[PDB]
Protein backbone atom coordinates (compact mmCIF):
# COMPACT_ATOMS: atom_id res chain seq x y z
CA UNK A 1 0.00 0.00 0.00
CA UNK A 2 0.89 3.74 -0.16
CA UNK A 3 1.99 5.22 3.25
CA UNK A 4 -0.84 7.82 3.09
CA UNK A 5 -3.11 6.79 0.21
CA UNK A 6 -4.18 9.86 -1.84
CA UNK A 7 -6.16 11.04 -4.85
CA UNK A 8 -4.54 13.42 -7.34
CA UNK A 9 -5.49 14.70 -10.78
CA UNK A 10 -3.23 15.54 -13.73
CA UNK A 11 -4.12 17.10 -17.09
CA UNK A 12 -1.94 15.14 -19.55
CA UNK A 13 -1.80 11.94 -21.61
CA UNK A 14 -2.26 8.84 -19.35
CA UNK A 15 0.27 7.08 -21.70
CA UNK A 16 2.99 9.27 -19.93
CA UNK A 17 1.81 8.38 -16.34
CA UNK A 18 4.19 8.02 -13.38
CA UNK A 19 2.19 5.20 -11.68
CA UNK A 20 2.86 1.45 -11.24
CA UNK A 21 -0.08 0.50 -13.53
CA UNK A 22 -2.63 2.02 -15.91
CA UNK A 23 -6.39 1.62 -16.44
CA UNK A 24 -7.39 1.64 -20.13
CA UNK A 25 -10.85 3.04 -21.04
CA UNK A 26 -11.23 -0.07 -23.24
CA UNK A 27 -13.81 -1.29 -25.67
CA UNK A 28 -15.26 -4.77 -25.18
CA UNK A 29 -13.49 -6.24 -28.25
CA UNK A 30 -9.89 -5.33 -27.36
CA UNK A 31 -9.68 -3.03 -30.40
CA UNK A 32 -7.23 -0.10 -30.60
CA UNK A 33 -10.24 2.30 -30.49
CA UNK A 34 -9.83 6.11 -30.11
CA UNK A 35 -8.96 8.65 -27.35
CA UNK A 36 -7.39 7.09 -24.17
CA UNK A 37 -7.73 3.58 -25.74
CA UNK A 38 -5.68 4.55 -28.88
CA UNK A 39 -2.95 6.25 -26.70
CA UNK A 40 -2.81 3.06 -24.56
CA UNK A 41 -2.61 0.88 -27.72
CA UNK A 42 0.32 2.94 -29.09
CA UNK A 43 2.21 2.85 -25.72
CA UNK A 44 1.42 -0.76 -24.61
CA UNK A 45 0.25 -2.67 -27.73
CA UNK A 46 1.38 -6.03 -26.22
CA UNK A 47 -1.32 -5.54 -23.53
CA UNK A 48 -4.09 -6.01 -26.15
CA UNK A 49 -3.44 -9.78 -26.52
CA UNK A 50 -6.80 -11.36 -25.41
CA UNK A 51 -7.88 -8.10 -23.71
CA UNK A 52 -11.54 -8.41 -25.00
CA UNK A 53 -13.90 -8.47 -21.95
CA UNK A 54 -17.60 -7.61 -21.40
CA UNK A 55 -19.10 -4.28 -20.42
CA UNK A 56 -18.81 -3.67 -16.66
CA UNK A 57 -15.64 -5.78 -16.27
CA UNK A 58 -11.87 -5.25 -16.12
CA UNK A 59 -9.23 -7.57 -17.53
CA UNK A 60 -5.52 -7.06 -16.85
CA UNK A 61 -2.81 -7.91 -19.45
CA UNK A 62 0.89 -7.35 -18.76
CA UNK A 63 3.08 -5.28 -21.12
CA UNK A 64 6.45 -6.64 -19.91
CA UNK A 65 5.89 -6.38 -16.16
CA UNK A 66 3.68 -3.23 -16.46
CA UNK A 67 -0.03 -4.05 -15.83
CA UNK A 68 -2.68 -2.59 -18.17
CA UNK A 69 -6.15 -2.96 -16.58
CA UNK A 70 -8.67 -2.89 -19.52
CA UNK A 71 -11.85 -1.48 -17.93
CA UNK A 72 -14.98 -1.50 -20.14
CA UNK A 73 -17.43 1.26 -19.26
CA UNK A 74 -20.85 1.28 -20.93
CA UNK A 75 -21.53 3.30 -24.09
CA UNK A 76 -24.47 5.48 -22.95
CA UNK A 77 -25.53 5.69 -26.65
CA UNK A 78 -26.54 1.98 -26.29
CA UNK A 79 -27.55 1.67 -22.54
CA UNK A 80 -30.48 3.29 -20.69
CA UNK A 81 -29.32 5.83 -18.02
CA UNK A 82 -30.24 3.23 -15.32
CA UNK A 83 -28.43 0.23 -16.88
CA UNK A 84 -25.46 2.40 -17.97
CA UNK A 85 -25.10 3.75 -14.44
CA UNK A 86 -25.10 0.15 -13.04
CA UNK A 87 -22.44 -1.06 -15.54
CA UNK A 88 -20.26 2.07 -14.99
CA UNK A 89 -20.24 1.46 -11.21
CA UNK A 90 -19.48 -2.24 -11.85
CA UNK A 91 -16.49 -1.49 -14.16
CA UNK A 92 -14.88 0.58 -11.37
CA UNK A 93 -15.51 -2.15 -8.71
CA UNK A 94 -13.63 -4.61 -11.04
CA UNK A 95 -10.77 -2.05 -11.35
CA UNK A 96 -10.52 -1.90 -7.52
CA UNK A 97 -10.32 -5.73 -7.39
CA UNK A 98 -7.54 -5.77 -10.02
CA UNK A 99 -5.53 -2.93 -8.40
CA UNK A 100 -5.77 -4.85 -5.08
CA UNK A 101 -4.82 -8.23 -6.64
CA UNK A 102 -1.76 -6.69 -8.42
CA UNK A 103 -0.40 -5.29 -5.10
CA UNK A 104 0.57 -1.97 -6.76
CA UNK A 105 1.12 1.17 -4.64
CA UNK A 106 -0.23 3.50 -7.40
CA UNK A 107 -2.58 3.44 -10.42
CA UNK A 108 -3.25 5.92 -13.29
CA UNK A 109 -7.02 6.01 -14.11
CA UNK A 110 -9.16 7.90 -16.66
CA UNK A 111 -12.85 8.78 -16.02
CA UNK A 112 -14.73 5.87 -17.69
CA UNK A 113 -17.62 6.63 -20.10
CA UNK A 114 -16.90 10.43 -20.16
CA UNK A 115 -15.64 10.62 -23.79
CA UNK A 116 -17.13 8.94 -26.91
CA UNK A 117 -19.15 6.54 -24.55
CA UNK A 118 -20.84 9.50 -22.71
CA UNK A 119 -23.87 9.59 -25.11
CA UNK A 120 -23.10 13.35 -25.49
CA UNK A 121 -23.65 14.12 -21.74
CA UNK A 122 -21.31 15.56 -19.06
CA UNK A 123 -20.70 12.59 -16.76
CA UNK A 124 -17.70 14.00 -14.81
CA UNK A 125 -19.52 13.82 -11.45
CA UNK A 126 -21.29 10.48 -12.18
CA UNK A 127 -18.07 8.76 -13.33
CA UNK A 128 -15.82 10.31 -10.61
CA UNK A 129 -18.26 9.36 -7.79
CA UNK A 130 -18.29 5.75 -9.03
CA UNK A 131 -14.45 5.86 -9.12
CA UNK A 132 -14.44 7.04 -5.48
CA UNK A 133 -17.03 4.40 -4.40
CA UNK A 134 -14.77 1.66 -5.80
CA UNK A 135 -11.29 2.99 -4.94
CA UNK A 136 -11.90 4.50 -1.45
CA UNK A 137 -11.35 1.07 0.25
CA UNK A 138 -8.06 0.54 -1.68
CA UNK A 139 -4.68 1.83 -0.34
CA UNK A 140 -3.11 2.59 -3.75
CA UNK A 141 -2.23 6.23 -4.64
CA UNK A 142 -4.82 7.04 -7.36
CA UNK A 143 -3.86 9.57 -10.07
CA UNK A 144 -6.78 10.60 -12.31
CA UNK A 145 -5.85 11.69 -15.86
CA UNK A 146 -7.92 14.20 -17.86
CA UNK A 147 -7.37 16.44 -20.92
CA UNK A 148 -9.69 19.46 -20.36
CA UNK A 149 -8.64 22.43 -18.14
CA UNK A 150 -12.16 22.93 -16.63
CA UNK A 151 -12.41 19.14 -15.93
CA UNK A 152 -9.00 19.33 -14.10
CA UNK A 153 -10.39 22.20 -11.90
CA UNK A 154 -13.66 20.29 -11.17
CA UNK A 155 -11.92 16.96 -10.37
CA UNK A 156 -9.36 18.79 -8.14
CA UNK A 157 -12.21 20.55 -6.30
CA UNK A 158 -14.11 17.23 -5.76
CA UNK A 159 -10.92 15.60 -4.39
CA UNK A 160 -10.11 18.57 -2.06
CA UNK A 161 -13.78 18.77 -0.80
CA UNK A 162 -13.48 15.34 0.95
CA UNK A 163 -10.01 16.05 2.59
CL1 LIG B 1 0.54 15.40 -22.61
CL1 LIG C 1 -15.23 7.04 -23.06
CL1 LIG D 1 -11.13 15.47 -19.89
Curated annotation (Swiss-Prot):
Q: Which residues make up the binding site for ADP-D-ribose? A: 13, 27, 35, 115-117
Q: What is the effect of changing residue 117 to V/W?
A: Almost complete loss of mono-ADP-ribosylhydrolase activity
Domain of life where this protein originates: Viruses
Q: Where in the cell is it found?
A: Host cytoplasmic vesicle membrane
As for PTM, the annotation reads:
Phosphorylated by host on serines and threonines.
Locate the Macro domain: which residues?
4-163
Q: How does it sit in the membrane?
A: Peripheral membrane protein
| Annotated phenotype, changing residue 27 to R/Y | Almost complete loss of mono-ADP-ribosylhydrolase activity
Q: What is known of its domains?
A: In the N-terminus, the macro domain displays a mono-ADP-ribosylhydrolase activity. The central part called, the alphavirus unique domain (AUD) has a zinc-binding function. The C-terminus region, also called hypervariable domain (HVD), is mainly disordered and binds several host proteins. This intrinsically disordered domain contains 2 SH3 domain-binding sites and 2 FGDF motifs necessary and sufficient for the formation of nsP3/G3BP complexes.
Q: What does this protein do?
A: Seems to be essential for minus-strand RNAs and subgenomic 26S mRNAs synthesis. Displays mono-ADP-ribosylhydrolase activity. ADP-ribosylation is a post-translational modification that controls various processes of the host cell and the virus probably needs to revert it for optimal viral replication. Binds proteins of G3BP family and sequesters them into the viral RNA replication complexes thereby inhibiting the formation of host stress granules on viral mRNAs.
Q: How does it assemble?
A: Interacts with mRNA-capping enzyme nsP1. Interacts (via C-terminus) with host G3BP1; this interaction inhibits the formation of host stress granules on viral mRNAs and the nsp3-G3BP1 complexes bind viral RNAs and probably orchestrate the assembly of viral replication complexes. Interacts (via C-terminus) with host G3BP2; this interaction inhibits the formation of host stress granules on viral mRNAs and the nsp3-G3BP2 complexes bind viral RNAs and probably orchestrate the assembly of viral replication complexes. Interacts (via C-terminus) with host NAP1L1.
Give the protein's recorded name: Non-structural protein 3
Positions spanned in the full protein? 1334 to 1493 of 2474
